[model samples]
Target: STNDNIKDLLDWYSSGSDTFTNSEVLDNSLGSMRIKNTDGSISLIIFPSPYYSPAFTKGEKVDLNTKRTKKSQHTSEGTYIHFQISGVTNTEKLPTPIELPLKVKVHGKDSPLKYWPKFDKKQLAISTLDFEIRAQLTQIHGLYRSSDKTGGYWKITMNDGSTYQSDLSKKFEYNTEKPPINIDEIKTIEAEIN
Candidate 1:
């Protein structure tokens, strides 16, 4: 009873209880109450609600300081829409064909092709070469093999059915311009067909 009165006294002073001792509370939502221990020292006593301060209530409000516990959970399950078509791709199983004669282009900016030979010769030295030459040769194309020695002769017909002959083996005939391709570089040339 005396201890009870002490809290009342404290409350009275805290509220300066005009009637009780009104200064404030031992409403003692003072969240806690201070009491003089028998040991001659003051100890803070907290039991019902320590945070009950700023406590606005009359003295009997011991549990006026009753406590509370807050609970929360941040959980979500769903999908969000994207603003743009980004990293996702929709490729096809096979590519569609384009128009005919598609004017194809190459890595060099010019369309490329496999080098096709217009004419080819066979039968003599260095059989490995496909006789792949840089440009189209005459209808006479690859030189027919001439005698193995120098000063041989040869003849071939034009695509138009006319014919001509030359002694290119060591022949001395020379033209200043637009001459037939020189077969001297050719390893083979025939002297004559007869």
Candidate 2:
């Protein structure tokens, strides 16, 4: 099958230590990066690792490593990149293994040729952009409620520097009376050029 052949090719490419030819690296506004073949299709590759922190505060610098995902085949539809931030201070102390919700965005690039195979050969030859994304962090609110019925809330900053709030009362009411919440409202951080 074509998928198997693609997988084998990717395995071979990934295992080898040879540097990709200049043409192999897609240069775009996003940044310089390589592509991978999976299931007979090429997709963007990124590797995100554990984010580091110096101290806990309202504003702090965090270091993050990259991680690459398997080449995605769904082209027209954008891909979703999920990041996990650990070691966050909660309630005066770091919570025991706490994970925030996943954030989603419209994965895009300056030149479509890098991701769109239909234009690969022709467009790749003329495009001079690199693959890159805006890196910023913003605060968001996480709504909650106290035992006394007063509204409680917390702020969560996303990688793009956009913040979101959780409304415990709104959430409860929505869950009990409304249909599923809109995914866009839950995660609406926009990525701008850094």
Candidate 3:
């Protein structure tokens, strides 16, 4: 009785033009969500920060200017919320342009996460190393297909937040190390996170 409606629905989503197709925005914002299918399969659903704010007000009107802002807010929220596929979550009514809080004590000492020389894969640019803070070391995005190595960077605020990109290839081993950077950067080992 309702075969055509079901077919229409299937065909509609089958076109591959749904939210997941454009999901990196979600990944960066809301961590990630998984959808389990009846046929013993799984899918992902990454969306806005509709939890605290009213970005996706049901049956509400949306404008052009607020378009980008709303989207950013949703993501800005998830990048805020208490959910990480393998990291910590912030819940201090997080400031917009969210700053991820961190306090690391490694090697029985107070520190930050080490930015080991690394290589990652993706056609998309997750390599554009951006927005990071540390009492020790950290790293982030740059979308490229590449390799090489590192050291020496900066503390930035974009507007002056300019971004750079590069590539990735394989690497051989090396014995490169730094003692640590602490020009009176006294860090104390406090409570720990598990």
Candidate 4:
């Protein structure tokens, strides 16, 4: 029922680009989709009222265009869906635009088990953050470099007032190794409590 409503809303509000199909659009890979506008623009995919879902409300839609103080300057290539929401005032601008996370809602006959028993490294990278963040979570993916290699990772909060690191590379490869504690699992990077 929700998927049907989402499908209908997407049909009514979104205009598909040549590079993006309806399926890709819903998958939230807007960045990979070619753009008509240049000159540092923001691309919005709206789901209008009447069928309005709680995740997005009418006022928030309006605020999306008006209230934000910063905008994204980059896009995610290869796998994830990317979008730009302006940053808040008095905050430092990120080095690059953020990648929205992805989430999956399995439907009849199209379940995870039907796809593959274990995810390929590439598929894991694509599906984990690329697909999960945008749909179900709010954290944004950012680029980082370590030991001369460049990659991305997610900053997610856990139930015990701690955070967990899901590296983009490890998702693809079967590395049973956990992230380094000092860099990956710190409460705060810089602190000066008086």
Q: What do the candidate models score in CA lDDT, each in turn?
A: 0.23, 0.22, 0.22, 0.24
Lowest lDDT sum, 10 consecutive residues, model 4, at 17-26
Candidate 2 lDDT at 170 equals 22
Per-candidate clash tally: 20, 32, 17, 12
Compute the lDDT of residue 114 as modeled in candidate 3.
47
Q: Which candidate, 2 or 4, would have the higher TM-score against the true structure?
A: 4
Candidate 4: global Cα-lDDT? 0.24
Candidate 4 ranges beyond 4 A from true positions: 1-42, 46-54, 61-147, 151-164, 170-194
Q: Which scores greater on lDDT, model 2 or model 4?
A: 4
RMSD of 3: 20.3
Q: Give the top-scoring candidate (lDDT).
A: 4
List, residue by residue over 1-194, the lDDT tens digit for candidate 4. Answer: 22343343233222221111111111223222222222223344322222222132222211121111133345564233224221101112234433322222221111111221221111112112222332121122111112212223445443356754444333222123222122122232110101
**Residue range 112-168, candidate 1, lDDT tens digits:** 324332222111111011111101111122222222212223443334544434442
Q: How far in Å is the alpha carbon of 32 misplaced in model 3?
A: 15
State the lDDT of candidate 3 residue by residue for 76-174, as single tens digits.
323322221111111112122322233433333454444422212111111112112211232222211112112223222223334221111211011
**How well does each candidate superpose onto the true structure, as a TM-score?**
0.17, 0.16, 0.17, 0.20
